[PDB]
Amino acid sequence: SHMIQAYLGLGSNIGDRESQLNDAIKILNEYDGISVSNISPIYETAPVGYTEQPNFLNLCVEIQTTLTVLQLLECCLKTEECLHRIRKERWGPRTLDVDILLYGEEMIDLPKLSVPHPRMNERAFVLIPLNDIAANVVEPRSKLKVKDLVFVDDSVKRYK
Ligand SMILES: Nc1nc2[nH]c(S)nc2c(=O)[nH]1
């Protein structure tokens, strides 16, 4: 029953984006082994990867968890599946991504999962809201605290 502090990155660009983020946090906190303990501000962020698609809202969440990293990944996938479900066929699918950004101070390298997220230091839509709740946490690949990894990116703006 060793409690680990972990940080998750959440994002949605289709549908009621703020509602997708809020629901994901609520679902995650409903698992017995996960307690949501802090939430970053939401940021609106230009899309990374394909450029012709809507802007994302992104945030990060701090959790206190007794789950293993792979148990945590299970809860994340179960939460994505759930919030992807269509409401009305004609309104289209909904999106939500939930990624594990940090799990304690551990480095994990498995075929099914790398934590810290391996290219997360490339992504302002991760590091800017991460810095609001995890400024002093050391990211173990780089050995930098989040506050020192974070960089200026004008494509990421506070949403509210
Ligand atoms: N800004 C931004 N771009 C993204 N591309 C994918 S895929 N996922 C995301 C995301 O969550 N945010």
Numbering used by the authors: -1 to 158
What did the publication describing this PDB structure actually write?
The x-ray crystal structure of SaHPPK in complex with the inhibitor, 8-mercaptoguanine was solved at high resolution. SaHPPK has a ferredoxin-like fold (αβα), with a central core of six β strands surrounded by four helices, typical of other monofunctional HPPK structures. The two monomers in the asymmetric unit are almost identical, with an RMSD of 0.34 Å over all 158 pairs of backbone Cα atoms. The catalytic loops L1, L2 and L3 (residues 12–14, 47–51, 82–94) have higher than average temperature factors, showing that they are likely mobile in solution, which parallels the observed broadening of residues in solution by NMR. The dimer interface encapsulates the active sites, leading to a buried surface area of 1595 Å, not including the inhibitor molecules. Like HMDP, the pyrimidine ring of 8-mercaptoguanine is stacked between the conserved aromatic residues, Phe54 and Phe123. A small cavity is found near the N7 position of 8-mercaptoguanine, in which a single water molecule resides, forming hydrogen bonds with the sidechain of Asp95 and the N7 of 8-mercaptoguanine. Notably, two of the interactions formed between HMDP and HPPK are absent in the case of 8-mercaptoguanine. Firstly, the imidazole ring of 8-mercaptoguanine is too far away to interact with Asp95, which forms a hydrogen bond with the hydroxymethyl group of HMDP.
6-Hydroxymethyl-7,8-dihydropterin pyrophosphokinase (HPPK, EC 2.7.6.3) catalyses pyrophosphoryl transfer from ATP (cofactor) to the substrate, 6-hydroxymethyl-7,8-dihydropterin (HMDP). HPPK is a small (158 residues, ∼18 kDa), generally monomeric protein and has been studied using various biophysical techniques, including x-ray crystallography and NMR spectroscopy. Three loop regions, loops L1–3, play an important role in substrate recognition and are critical for assembling the active centre. While loop L3 undergoes the largest and most dramatic conformational change during the catalytic cycle, all three loops help to seal the substrate and cofactor binding sites for the chemical transfer of a pyrophosphate from ATP to HMDP.
